[PDB]
Amino acid sequence: MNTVPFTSAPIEVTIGIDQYSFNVKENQPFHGIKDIPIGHVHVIHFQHADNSSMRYGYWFDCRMGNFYIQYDPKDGLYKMMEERDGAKFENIVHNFKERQMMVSYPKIDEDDTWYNLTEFVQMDKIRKIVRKDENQFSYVDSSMTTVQENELSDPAHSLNYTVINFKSREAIRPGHEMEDFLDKSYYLNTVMLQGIFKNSSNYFGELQFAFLNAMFFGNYGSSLQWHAMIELICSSATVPKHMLDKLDEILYYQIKTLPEQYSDILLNERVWNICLYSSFQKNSLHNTEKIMENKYPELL
Amino acid sequence: GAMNSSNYAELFNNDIKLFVDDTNVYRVTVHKTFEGNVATKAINGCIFTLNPKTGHLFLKIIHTSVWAGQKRLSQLAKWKTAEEVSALVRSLPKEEQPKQIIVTRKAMLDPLEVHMLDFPNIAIRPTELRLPFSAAMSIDKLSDVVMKATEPQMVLFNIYDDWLDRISSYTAFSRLTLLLRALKTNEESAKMILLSDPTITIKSYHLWPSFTDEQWITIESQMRDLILTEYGRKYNV
Ligand SMILES: O=C(O)[C@@]1(NCc2ccccc2)CCOC1
């Protein structure tokens, strides 16, 4: 198990670690999070008590380095940093653990939620969507725009998701206009999977990362990307059976984890009604259809 | 965006534009089969593509062979329309290509947009005008060329005859739409109004009779009366 210590907590803040959230009071003796499961990416995120504007946070993998959080009173935020001195880091952590000034990542043994939400998410792929090569961890916030949002303004601070546009020359072969617009299989299988993503695992990884940024930061462009990647599959007549079965699992766990009270801002009624009831794959997502009908029947 | 009454003079400015009406592309008659089921028989149709400033009509005749062995014909008809309009655009010299294409039915927006991806600067727009272009097949010379066609064919017409020698495009379009609305509302009576005077003929190279300026005023009044008469008959007014 790994640990992300905090130097201190000078401002009152709600801290989230993956799907869990907890409050810290101004100048509370809080010095970090321990028992973080090795083997997955993680996200540590923040919403200030005195200014719920800008949710922000950091994606990281404790296998890549020793990371800690320290508040910056000039830029006014909790910043992730890497500690290259290993013995210093271990000694800091050991003292904070002995004084019991850390919270424990409260993973229930039976509970596979975080694995199920991050199955295909890799830190190396995150670092290509979020470009800041001098750090091993990636900062995301609620306001960051996507490369596609910008085309329609600072490029260094953008989310470089793969652009999906159903009415673009990339999506439509000259001479196959009706075919490719009504059946997106070409665009999914040749352009996106074989061409850009190389395999379905990388495609699902980006889909999962987009959902998580939408949910944890309220990042609108990420929500747009998540829905576009779902619609591209559901609107394709020819999809490998293993991808359809995996998508049903992915979406089921996403819908299961979504806060009920955020469904109005995180779920696109058009896309979901199309995907579940009109699309080529309307009958291939049994688990997702069942949870959607029981949890959010108003949206449908 | 959408074209309506507020931006109506835009139709007659110097930016080349075309209206595309697809209402006569896929035409059928419905009949009973020997077993008492119902079947359709397609008949030749046409795309109505009109420059409202110059009166140039690009009438693409849609021969029934294009439906042979195809499914979902009403859907295919929209994509065939978009394909043919795109092909017409590509066939025109650059300086004759439209800057805007206005579709009379909003279901044509996506088919045409997708076919015109190679022309990102040609705007594809809907309209809130209710235009009577479906009645194009009530113009005898247009109906004749469509029905006689044995293969796909494009025929070029000036739907305003020589009117622009005497009237503006705005006025010509208003006359055309009144004539077509009358033919749509009561075709027999409209045709009777247009041919009631044997001494006024249709030139070989024209679609409409050779009315003098004053006769056009009388004809236009009779067309308005027909439309109003039919409205009262319909609604018991
Ligand atoms: O009230 C709280 O703090 C909650 N989070 C528990 C938690 C505490 C420390 C570390 C991670 C999680 C309990 C239910 O959900 C909110």
XYZ file of C-alpha atoms and ligand atoms in Angstrom:
553
model
C 0.000 0.000 0.000
C 1.177 3.546 -0.824
C 0.713 6.938 0.733
C 0.208 10.549 -0.354
C 1.178 12.763 2.586
C 0.100 16.366 2.926
C 2.425 18.986 4.324
C -0.585 20.646 5.960
C -4.172 21.710 5.263
C -4.291 25.508 5.666
C -7.670 26.022 3.948
C -10.932 24.195 4.576
C -11.563 21.813 1.696
C -13.534 18.750 0.623
C -10.986 16.165 -0.539
C -11.913 13.267 -2.759
C -9.844 10.138 -3.463
C -11.386 8.169 -6.419
C -15.149 7.701 -5.537
C -14.688 8.579 -1.774
C -14.971 12.093 -0.294
C -14.182 13.648 3.146
C -14.000 17.192 4.639
C -10.899 18.803 6.245
C -11.262 21.978 8.397
C -9.035 25.057 8.105
C -5.686 24.272 9.791
C -6.879 20.828 10.870
C -3.939 18.519 11.698
C -4.360 16.505 8.505
C -1.329 14.927 6.861
C -2.602 12.748 4.065
C -4.013 9.498 2.780
C -2.556 6.050 3.411
C -3.358 2.478 2.330
C -3.890 3.478 -1.304
C -4.243 0.286 -3.351
C -1.328 -0.457 -5.588
C -2.177 -1.520 -9.120
C -4.548 1.219 -10.263
C -4.416 4.840 -11.242
C -5.934 7.145 -8.657
C -7.264 10.678 -8.500
C -7.000 13.050 -5.556
C -9.380 15.974 -5.965
C -10.369 19.152 -4.195
C -13.230 21.583 -3.779
C -12.561 24.569 -1.558
C -15.104 25.269 1.165
C -15.001 29.038 0.701
C -15.169 28.819 -3.097
C -16.774 25.776 -4.731
C -15.567 27.284 -8.008
C -12.882 25.231 -9.638
C -12.965 21.673 -8.567
C -9.426 20.467 -9.429
C -7.252 17.418 -8.869
C -4.417 15.116 -9.884
C -4.293 11.722 -11.512
C -1.359 9.645 -10.304
C 0.026 6.127 -9.873
C 2.118 5.472 -6.735
C 4.212 2.985 -8.723
C 5.706 5.892 -10.677
C 7.094 7.946 -7.787
C 6.552 9.301 -4.305
C 3.927 12.058 -4.408
C 2.737 14.516 -1.797
C 0.375 17.494 -1.593
C 1.350 20.939 -0.385
C -0.786 24.067 -0.359
C 0.533 27.053 -2.327
C -0.736 30.325 -0.778
C 0.308 32.299 -3.860
C -1.577 30.272 -6.467
C -4.220 29.370 -3.864
C -4.390 25.645 -4.373
C -3.251 22.279 -3.146
C -0.453 21.166 -5.462
C 0.880 17.684 -6.087
C 4.656 17.388 -6.009
C 7.150 14.551 -6.395
C 9.751 13.849 -3.712
C 12.911 12.389 -5.244
C 14.625 11.791 -1.851
C 13.208 8.382 -0.952
C 14.523 8.115 2.599
C 13.190 11.582 3.406
C 9.779 10.606 2.052
C 9.633 7.318 3.966
C 10.575 9.121 7.192
C 7.924 11.801 6.678
C 5.260 9.171 6.010
C 6.359 7.001 8.939
C 6.083 9.885 11.442
C 2.674 10.981 10.139
C 1.418 7.401 10.325
C 2.696 6.973 13.881
C 0.946 10.167 14.967
C -2.215 8.867 13.247
C -2.632 12.045 11.212
C -3.675 10.333 8.011
C -7.019 8.945 6.764
C -7.092 5.395 5.322
C -8.309 4.736 1.695
C -11.438 2.862 2.961
C -11.649 0.076 0.359
C -14.208 -2.607 1.347
C -12.722 -6.014 0.510
C -15.776 -7.159 -1.513
C -15.811 -3.872 -3.451
C -14.404 -3.842 -6.975
C -15.901 -0.431 -7.908
C -12.636 1.390 -8.554
C -11.144 -1.439 -10.596
C -14.419 -1.599 -12.548
C -14.272 2.140 -13.307
C -10.552 2.191 -14.222
C -10.043 -1.278 -15.787
C -8.591 0.185 -18.997
C -7.230 3.504 -17.679
C -3.427 3.781 -17.816
C -1.300 6.621 -16.490
C 0.740 6.670 -19.685
C -2.416 7.346 -21.696
C -3.632 9.991 -19.246
C -0.321 11.837 -19.743
C -0.981 11.993 -23.499
C -4.449 13.479 -23.015
C -3.185 15.896 -20.322
C 0.152 17.283 -21.575
C 2.676 18.354 -18.905
C 5.681 16.134 -19.468
C 7.792 17.382 -16.537
C 5.430 15.766 -14.013
C 4.523 12.091 -13.632
C 1.011 13.067 -12.427
C -1.683 14.984 -14.311
C -3.714 18.002 -13.260
C -7.352 18.297 -14.357
C -10.015 20.837 -13.348
C -13.658 21.694 -13.999
C -12.951 24.449 -16.545
C -10.353 22.831 -18.814
C -11.580 22.678 -22.382
C -11.033 19.914 -24.884
C -9.198 20.204 -28.188
C -12.570 19.789 -29.932
C -14.268 22.449 -27.799
C -11.485 24.843 -28.802
C -11.854 24.195 -32.551
C -15.493 25.352 -32.197
C -8.333 28.842 -25.762
C -4.872 28.150 -24.286
C -3.707 24.900 -25.963
C -1.173 23.997 -23.236
C -4.018 23.600 -20.699
C -6.361 21.510 -22.863
C -7.765 18.005 -22.694
C -6.463 16.268 -25.829
C -9.188 13.693 -26.205
C -9.497 12.022 -29.600
C -11.780 14.173 -31.755
C -15.005 12.403 -32.783
C -17.283 14.212 -35.237
C -20.002 12.287 -37.040
C -20.278 14.906 -39.822
C -16.611 15.131 -40.762
C -14.581 13.792 -43.649
C -12.791 11.557 -41.157
C -16.095 9.796 -40.364
C -17.487 9.568 -43.911
C -15.821 7.886 -46.882
C -16.451 9.794 -50.119
C -18.866 7.599 -52.032
C -20.192 5.898 -48.900
C -22.035 8.900 -47.465
C -25.364 7.283 -46.567
C -23.707 4.024 -45.578
C -21.176 5.605 -43.198
C -23.600 8.142 -41.699
C -26.304 5.614 -40.850
C -23.821 2.857 -39.834
C -20.699 4.148 -38.101
C -18.850 0.775 -38.271
C -16.178 2.085 -40.658
C -15.459 5.062 -38.424
C -15.376 2.900 -35.276
C -13.444 -0.121 -36.561
C -11.102 1.225 -39.250
C -10.565 4.879 -38.337
C -10.743 4.802 -34.550
C -9.850 1.270 -33.431
C -7.376 0.120 -36.095
C -6.131 3.611 -36.940
C -6.002 5.876 -33.895
C -6.456 3.770 -30.739
C -4.845 0.559 -32.029
C -7.114 -1.581 -29.835
C -10.340 -1.563 -27.848
C -8.536 -1.365 -24.492
C -7.130 2.088 -25.303
C -10.545 3.205 -26.578
C -12.280 2.079 -23.387
C -9.500 3.644 -21.344
C -10.218 7.061 -22.831
C -13.988 6.547 -22.427
C -13.506 5.645 -18.769
C -11.168 8.580 -18.133
C -13.631 10.987 -19.759
C -16.456 9.750 -17.543
C -14.356 10.107 -14.410
C -13.332 13.666 -15.252
C -16.968 14.506 -15.967
C -18.088 13.024 -12.656
C -15.293 14.184 -10.338
C -14.736 17.693 -11.752
C -17.998 18.466 -13.553
C -15.869 18.921 -16.659
C -18.350 19.498 -19.479
C -16.084 18.606 -22.399
C -15.271 15.301 -20.751
C -18.967 14.508 -20.491
C -19.299 15.308 -24.210
C -16.438 12.921 -25.036
C -17.836 10.122 -22.892
C -21.197 10.310 -24.646
C -19.611 10.544 -28.113
C -17.564 7.394 -27.520
C -20.658 5.525 -26.350
C -22.730 6.730 -29.284
C -20.031 5.774 -31.795
C -20.215 2.142 -30.644
C -23.984 1.979 -30.300
C -24.452 3.521 -33.760
C -22.228 0.869 -35.403
C -23.888 -2.254 -36.806
C -20.662 -4.292 -36.682
C -18.928 -4.375 -33.308
C -16.910 -7.314 -31.932
C -18.944 -9.269 -29.400
C -16.264 -8.898 -26.738
C -16.394 -5.111 -27.040
C -20.181 -4.997 -26.648
C -20.098 -7.215 -23.592
C -17.274 -5.183 -22.087
C -19.057 -1.882 -22.818
C -22.138 -3.133 -20.993
C -19.975 -3.815 -17.922
C -18.198 -0.468 -18.172
C -21.403 1.526 -18.437
C -23.175 -0.472 -15.754
C -20.536 0.441 -13.182
C -20.495 4.061 -14.329
C -24.275 4.413 -13.983
C -24.115 2.569 -10.646
C -21.537 5.006 -9.268
C -23.069 8.247 -10.575
C -24.612 10.314 -7.758
C -28.378 10.218 -8.196
C -28.538 13.984 -7.651
C -26.146 14.739 -10.563
C -28.014 12.695 -13.187
C -29.616 15.809 -14.697
C -26.182 17.303 -15.486
C -24.196 14.130 -16.288
C -26.574 12.155 -18.567
C -27.586 13.237 -22.082
C -31.195 12.153 -22.585
C -30.895 12.136 -26.371
C -27.797 9.946 -26.419
C -29.058 7.422 -23.890
C -32.526 7.028 -25.384
C -30.936 6.594 -28.808
C -28.353 4.122 -27.522
C -30.720 1.992 -25.481
C -33.872 2.054 -27.616
C -33.106 3.037 -31.251
C -29.479 2.111 -32.014
C -28.038 -0.994 -33.663
C -26.944 -2.076 -30.183
C -30.268 -1.352 -28.425
C -30.419 -5.011 -27.307
C -26.709 -5.560 -26.547
C -26.540 -3.591 -23.290
C -28.813 -5.603 -21.024
C -27.099 -4.794 -17.731
C -26.840 -1.070 -18.470
C -30.419 -0.922 -19.741
C -31.676 -2.611 -16.576
C -29.860 -0.269 -14.172
C -30.796 2.834 -16.215
C -34.493 1.849 -16.237
C -34.525 1.212 -12.485
C -32.358 4.134 -11.361
C -33.158 6.920 -13.876
C -36.520 6.059 -15.482
C -37.360 9.773 -15.729
C -34.498 10.384 -18.167
C -36.113 7.793 -20.438
C -29.475 29.798 -40.280
C -33.097 29.238 -41.309
C -34.576 31.352 -44.092
C -37.884 33.109 -43.363
C -39.935 36.268 -43.998
C -37.538 38.505 -42.064
C -34.620 37.691 -44.410
C -36.701 37.285 -47.597
C -34.895 39.869 -49.727
C -31.780 37.719 -49.235
C -33.161 35.404 -51.924
C -32.649 38.102 -54.580
C -29.200 39.417 -53.687
C -26.058 38.666 -55.697
C -24.896 35.644 -53.671
C -25.683 32.535 -55.752
C -28.131 30.270 -53.995
C -30.342 27.342 -54.815
C -33.546 25.958 -53.351
C -33.740 22.139 -53.332
C -37.156 20.496 -53.072
C -37.225 16.691 -52.802
C -41.047 16.228 -52.599
C -41.312 14.651 -56.077
C -38.187 12.439 -56.024
C -39.904 9.226 -54.848
C -43.413 9.012 -56.288
C -45.702 5.991 -56.012
C -49.194 4.746 -56.660
C -50.713 2.377 -54.098
C -52.828 -0.560 -55.263
C -54.271 -3.874 -54.120
C -52.578 -7.126 -55.139
C -54.360 -10.240 -56.352
C -54.161 -11.708 -52.856
C -55.747 -8.533 -51.461
C -52.556 -7.051 -50.020
C -51.274 -3.574 -50.869
C -48.269 -2.805 -53.035
C -46.660 0.317 -54.405
C -45.592 1.029 -57.962
C -42.995 3.746 -58.361
C -43.226 6.343 -61.117
C -40.557 8.690 -62.426
C -39.791 11.620 -60.185
C -37.557 14.656 -60.149
C -35.380 16.891 -57.986
C -36.442 20.542 -58.187
C -33.303 22.707 -57.816
C -34.010 26.381 -58.449
C -31.975 29.595 -58.457
C -34.614 32.101 -57.250
C -32.674 35.093 -58.629
C -32.240 33.920 -62.208
C -35.059 31.382 -62.573
C -32.671 28.629 -63.653
C -34.181 25.262 -62.787
C -31.971 22.180 -62.770
C -34.592 19.436 -63.100
C -32.928 16.079 -62.412
C -35.268 13.333 -63.550
C -35.256 10.355 -61.196
C -36.017 7.268 -63.258
C -37.760 4.372 -61.520
C -34.777 2.100 -62.221
C -32.852 3.812 -59.439
C -35.170 2.190 -56.884
C -34.798 -1.337 -58.273
C -33.827 -3.741 -55.529
C -33.435 -1.022 -52.940
C -34.937 -0.950 -49.460
C -36.227 1.923 -47.332
C -36.960 3.991 -50.385
C -38.251 7.113 -48.635
C -34.943 7.319 -46.734
C -32.845 6.489 -49.784
C -34.651 9.203 -51.746
C -33.226 11.877 -49.462
C -29.668 10.563 -49.869
C -30.090 10.211 -53.637
C -31.286 13.816 -53.725
C -28.224 14.930 -51.749
C -25.960 12.879 -54.018
C -27.412 14.458 -57.136
C -27.254 18.019 -55.783
C -23.632 17.481 -54.738
C -22.887 16.158 -58.242
C -24.542 19.216 -59.804
C -22.448 21.538 -57.653
C -19.230 19.744 -58.639
C -20.248 19.969 -62.322
C -20.578 23.743 -62.183
C -17.623 26.096 -62.682
C -16.332 27.551 -59.436
C -17.801 30.969 -60.112
C -21.258 29.416 -60.638
C -21.292 27.256 -57.520
C -23.831 28.330 -54.902
C -22.807 29.935 -51.646
C -25.983 28.619 -49.965
C -28.378 25.727 -50.584
C -31.824 26.076 -48.955
C -33.744 22.804 -48.485
C -37.539 23.002 -48.374
C -37.784 20.026 -45.984
C -35.617 19.759 -42.889
C -35.076 15.999 -43.367
C -32.753 16.950 -46.239
C -30.326 18.850 -43.968
C -28.139 15.967 -42.805
C -28.052 14.076 -46.138
C -27.012 17.235 -47.965
C -24.522 18.358 -45.296
C -22.837 14.949 -45.415
C -22.649 14.946 -49.229
C -21.233 18.491 -49.207
C -18.461 17.991 -46.636
C -15.957 18.786 -49.435
C -17.553 22.291 -49.655
C -17.363 23.624 -46.078
C -18.102 27.168 -47.256
C -21.446 26.311 -48.887
C -24.084 26.903 -46.208
C -26.888 24.315 -46.032
C -29.990 25.945 -44.595
C -33.651 25.112 -43.890
C -36.512 27.535 -44.441
C -39.616 28.498 -42.525
C -41.327 29.427 -45.802
C -44.048 27.007 -46.940
C -43.155 26.844 -50.604
C -45.406 25.159 -53.177
C -42.659 23.488 -55.210
C -44.384 20.110 -54.906
C -46.743 21.439 -57.601
C -43.942 21.594 -60.167
C -45.401 18.447 -61.681
C -48.559 20.432 -62.443
C -46.602 22.419 -65.050
C -47.444 20.398 -68.143
C -44.044 20.625 -69.856
C -42.200 19.566 -66.688
C -44.544 16.627 -66.037
C -44.173 15.522 -69.669
C -40.368 15.336 -69.643
C -40.357 13.469 -66.338
C -42.909 10.902 -67.461
C -41.356 10.290 -70.879
C -37.876 9.695 -69.453
C -36.490 6.218 -70.026
C -33.208 6.857 -68.162
C -31.755 9.379 -65.710
C -31.634 12.806 -67.283
C -31.024 16.413 -66.320
C -33.125 19.068 -68.059
C -32.511 22.816 -67.682
C -35.336 25.325 -67.737
C -35.919 28.952 -66.898
C -38.989 28.759 -64.679
C -39.628 32.482 -65.170
C -39.782 32.344 -69.005
C -38.819 35.907 -70.078
C -40.417 37.652 -67.103
C -37.140 39.137 -65.855
C -37.062 41.336 -68.959
C -39.978 43.240 -67.374
C -40.065 42.490 -63.629
C -37.612 42.018 -60.771
C -36.626 38.648 -59.345
C -38.620 39.401 -56.193
C -41.764 39.905 -58.271
C -41.031 36.904 -60.484
C -40.636 34.625 -57.471
C -43.852 35.992 -56.001
C -45.678 35.277 -59.259
C -44.212 31.765 -59.437
C -45.168 30.923 -55.868
C -48.702 32.239 -56.367
C -49.117 30.172 -59.535
C -47.757 27.031 -57.881
C -49.825 27.515 -54.742
C -52.943 27.840 -56.917
C -52.022 24.707 -58.880
C -51.457 22.862 -55.605
C -54.768 24.047 -54.150
C -57.032 23.466 -57.183
C -55.118 22.267 -60.205
C -58.052 22.050 -62.621
C -59.283 25.557 -61.855
C -55.786 27.026 -61.959
C -55.150 25.471 -65.385
C -58.520 26.772 -66.583
C -57.550 30.313 -65.523
C -54.271 30.016 -67.406
C -55.785 28.691 -70.655
C -59.222 30.374 -70.599
C -58.219 32.673 -73.481
C -57.217 30.630 -76.579
C -55.581 33.719 -78.103
C -52.869 33.665 -75.411
C -50.481 30.807 -76.043
C -47.392 29.248 -74.487
C -44.350 29.769 -76.673
C -42.504 26.596 -77.687
C -39.573 27.723 -75.514
C -41.690 28.723 -72.461
C -43.562 27.016 -69.638
C -46.277 29.624 -69.060
C -48.539 31.665 -71.379
C -47.419 34.919 -72.979
C -49.454 37.324 -70.888
C -49.135 41.054 -71.208
C -48.338 43.041 -68.083
C -52.026 43.887 -67.597
C -53.129 40.313 -68.258
C -50.701 39.072 -65.610
C -52.427 41.404 -63.142
C -55.803 39.874 -63.997
C -54.416 36.336 -63.842
C -52.745 36.941 -60.481
C -56.034 38.291 -59.094
C -57.895 35.226 -60.380
C -55.295 32.978 -58.734
C -55.679 34.765 -55.380
C -59.465 34.394 -55.698
C -59.064 30.667 -56.361
C -56.909 30.251 -53.267
C -59.331 32.204 -51.107
C -62.338 30.343 -52.567
C -60.696 27.002 -51.743
C -59.905 28.195 -48.226
C -63.582 28.999 -47.609
C -64.659 25.653 -49.076
C -62.168 23.809 -46.859
C -63.009 25.510 -43.570
C -66.690 26.281 -44.299
C -66.012 30.019 -44.165
O -18.428 11.812 5.826
C -17.412 11.365 5.338
O -16.247 11.591 5.529
C -17.710 10.272 4.220
N -16.432 9.765 3.554
C -15.668 8.736 4.357
C -14.176 8.914 4.220
C -13.423 9.400 5.285
C -12.072 9.509 5.173
C -11.454 9.131 3.998
C -12.196 8.649 2.949
C -13.555 8.543 3.058
C -18.483 9.118 4.828
C -19.542 8.841 3.776
O -19.186 9.616 2.684
C -18.661 10.778 3.172
